[PDB]
Amino acid sequence: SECVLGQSKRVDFCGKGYHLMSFPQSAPHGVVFLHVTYVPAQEKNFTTAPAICHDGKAHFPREGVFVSNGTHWFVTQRNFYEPQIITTDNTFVSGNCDVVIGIVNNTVYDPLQPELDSFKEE
């Protein structure tokens, strides 16, 4: 019921790994389930941050986490590396950045400033 007619959020109930689906198979005096699972592998080690202070405002991600490979910062989702430029639509704000701990500094690109700056250039 919970793994053929749907997707189990129950971890490691239907197969080991993140569950996607299943398929049933008949068996004499029994049944056979074939769980299909998403298994992450082949990772890297990044240096992270909990949050970012841009102007005083703390920034947190709507989804994902802030990462740094080096001389650059990104945000990306959580079971797959797919680094994205940080924007105000990836993140959200709450409070000042004196209250957070472990925070770092970085500038957040804003997608409105370039269009507006383009019009001042005109």
Binding site: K16, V31, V32, L34, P40, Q42, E43, K44, N79
Partner: protein, 389 residues
């Protein structure tokens, strides 16, 4: 061992696994017999051969103690029409050893020994003399044709024909209820008098002082033997007591209701009784399509009583210990597992739980996947079984 497994499983093929097959039990090495010994012999000839006997109305209870019995000579001689014993077999009395013996002497007519049996009802049984239904002892009867039978009748012996009440067993009570019988040898066998005597023992529940002509054997300690203390046989290993024993008791008894501690029937020392060692036996083996080599596990018994290896399961023989850790292939117990790997032999080892590892950690380091993989797990379950009626 492998043949024992093949016999147990009822197949010529044995798979990789552990199979229980048998039990091991240390056997006795000899017998030791012990008894109290009295310098007096029990006067049984004095009662059967007494020239004048008790009537059934006033029947004689003589008591016996503080003597060595010899029933075998009384058995083995033939002077007795019948020799029946109830709760006890007449050949076996020379083995047991008792606290009291009562000889209940009187004479009776022949058709009425049909009636003397314990719990059997009838005139003589309920009005004159009674034996309880839980009676233990021996009844002897022998025909009297020149002893209590004589020409011109014999009216020295009385029987109570009526009574207003019944007996508690082993009691004597002192138209007129008492009548007499005529005993000539001219009458038929049913009318002749029969000298009958009842030997009611009380079994050992106290220090015994009455038993057969046997000789003791000197005791031993710290070796499994087949003991016999006051008639209670048995097997185990005897040892000196750390206990403090009370000066009226003999037997210390368990929750299991078997003897644990005795006092010597003719010494004042106190001995603790331990049954000599035993344990279940199971075979460790791989499948027969690889090899016939085996190992044995003597459960719950260590290796001072049976390559050897001591485990908290028991004594393991046929396997070699290895201080590497390979994942389990055969379970045994106590964290030990066995396998058959390369010449080639069974080995034992402490199971690993997977490889020692650790996750790197800090407050500013994370790991994210870059790729992935799709596995497919199999998960089998049963749903039903055969509908048997």
């Amino acid at each position: 061992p492998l043949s024992e497994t093949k016999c147990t499983l009822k197949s010529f093929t044995v798979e990789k696994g552990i199979y229980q097959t048998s039990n091991f039990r240390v056997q006795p090495t000899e017998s030791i017999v012990r008894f109290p010994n009295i310098t007096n012999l029990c006067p049984f000839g004095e009662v059967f051969n007494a020239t004048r006997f008790a009537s059934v109305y006033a029947w004689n209870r003589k008591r016996i103690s503080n003597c060595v019995a010899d029933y075998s000579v009384l058995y083995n001689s033939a002077s007795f029409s019948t020799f029946k014993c109830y709760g006890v077999s007449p050949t076996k009395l020379n083995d047991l050893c008792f606290t009291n013996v009562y000889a209940d002497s009187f004479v009776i007519r022949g058709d009425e020994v049909r009636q003397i049996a314990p719990g059997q009802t009838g005139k003589i049984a309920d009005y004159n003399y009674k034996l309880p239904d839980d009676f233990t002892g021996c009844v002897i009867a022998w025909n009297s044709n020149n002893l209590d039978s004589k020409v011109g009748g014999n009216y020295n012996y009385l029987y109570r024909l009526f009574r207003k009440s019944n007996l508690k067993p082993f009691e004597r009570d002192i138209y007129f209820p008492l009548q007499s019988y005529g005993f000539q040898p001219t009458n038929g066998v049913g009318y002749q008098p029969y000298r009958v005597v009842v030997l009611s023992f009380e079994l050992l529940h106290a220090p015994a002082t009455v038993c057969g002509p046997k000789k003791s054997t000197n005791l031993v300690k710290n070796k499994c033997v087949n003991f016999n203390f006051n008639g209670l046989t048995g097997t185990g290993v005897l040892t000196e007591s750390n206990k403090k024993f009370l000066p009226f008791q003999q037997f210390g008894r368990d929750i299991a209701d078997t003897t644990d501690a005795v006092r010597d029937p003719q010494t004042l020392e106190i001995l603790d009784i331990t049954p000599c060692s035993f344990g279940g036996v199971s075979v460790i083996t791989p499948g027969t399509n690889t090899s016939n080599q085996v190992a044995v596990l003597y459960q719950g018994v260590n290796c001072t009583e049976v390559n050897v290896f001591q485990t908290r399961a028991g004594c393991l023989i046929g396997a070699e210990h290895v201080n590497n850790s390979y994942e389990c292939d055969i379970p045994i117990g106590a964290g030990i597992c066995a396998s058959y790997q390369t010449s080639q032999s069974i080995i034992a080892y402490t199971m690993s739980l997977g490889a020692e590892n650790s996750v790197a950690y800090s407050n500013n380091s994370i790991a994210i996947p870059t790729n992935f993989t799709i596995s497919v797990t199999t998960e089998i379950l049963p749903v039903s079984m055969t509908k048997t009626s």
